[PDB]
C-alpha cells in the first residue's frame, strides 16, 4: 500500500475499549499539551495544499498531529495508552525530520515533548477498566 493517508479514528479489526490508561491520556496528557502556548500548529493535520509543500509526503513517512491523536482517544481504536504514546512520539519525530533544528515548530515540539514525558511518567504502569457513566436526562 502506497503513502496517501493521515491514519484513522476508529477500527473494527484491531481490538480496543475505554480504559483508565486511555482516560489518563485524553484527560491529563492531551488536556495539558492542548492548553500549552504552542499547541496551536498541532490542532489540525498539515494541509500540504494550503502550506504549499509539494514534497511533504516524500520526506514524511508517517504524518501525525495532536488533533488526530485525540480523535482516536474519543473512540475505541485501541485498548492501551502505549499506542497513544507512540503517536505522540511520531508527531514530534516527523516534525524534527522535515524542519531545521532551530525553526520555531521544532522548539515548540521540544517544549511539548518534555511535558508529555513528565505527564506519562505520572501515568500508572498497570491497566484497569473504567467505572460506568451516569445516565442521560435530556
From Swiss-Prot:
<feature type="region of interest" description="Acetylated histone H3 binding">
    <location>
        <begin position="61"/>
        <end position="63"/>
    </location>
</feature>
<comment type="similarity">
    <text>Belongs to the BET family.</text>
</comment>
<comment type="subunit">
    <text>Interacts (via bromo domain 1) with GATA1 acetylated at 'Lys-312' and 'Lys-315'. Interacts (via bromo domain 1) with GATA2 acetylated on lysine residues. Interacts (via NET domain) with CHD4 (via KIKL motif). Interacts (via NET domain) with SMARCA4 (via KIKL motif). Interacts (via NET domain) with NSD3 (via KIKL motif).</text>
</comment>
<protein>
    <recommendedName>
        <fullName>Bromodomain-containing protein 3</fullName>
    </recommendedName>
</protein>
<feature type="domain" description="Bromo 1">
    <location>
        <begin position="17"/>
        <end position="123"/>
    </location>
</feature>
<comment type="function">
    <text>Chromatin reader that recognizes and binds acetylated histones, thereby controlling gene expression and remodeling chromatin structures. Recruits transcription factors and coactivators to target gene sites, and activates RNA polymerase II machinery for transcriptional elongation. In vitro, binds acetylated lysine residues on the N-terminus of histone H2A, H2B, H3 and H4.</text>
</comment>
<comment type="subunit">
    <text>(Microbial infection) Interacts with the Integrase protein of Moloney murine leukemia virus (MLV).</text>
</comment>
Amino acid at each position: 500500500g502506497s503513502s496517501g493517508s493521515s491514519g484513522e479514528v476508529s477500527n473494527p479489526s484491531k481490538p480496543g475499549r475505554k480504559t483508565n490508561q486511555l482516560q489518563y491520556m485524553q484527560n491529563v496528557v492531551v488536556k495539558t499539551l492542548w492548553k500549552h502556548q504552542f499547541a496551536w500548529p498541532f490542532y489540525q493535520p498539515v494541509d500540504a495544499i494550503k502550506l504549499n509543500l509539494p514534497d511533504y509526503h516524500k520526506i514524511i513517512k508517517n504524518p501525525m498531529d495532536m488533533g488526530t491523536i485525540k480523535k482516536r482517544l474519543e473512540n475505541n481504536y485501541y485498548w492501551s495508552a502505549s499506542e497513544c504514546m507512540q503517536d505522540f512520539n511520531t508527531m514530534f519525530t516527523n516534525c524534527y525530520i522535515y524542519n531545521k533544528p532551530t525553526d520555531d515548530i521544532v522548539l515548540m515540539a521540544q517544549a511539548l515533548e518534555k511535558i508529555f514525558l513528565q505527564k506519562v511518567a505520572q501515568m500508572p504502569q498497570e491497566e484497569v477498566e473504567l467505572l460506568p457513566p451516569a445516565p442521560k436526562g435530556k
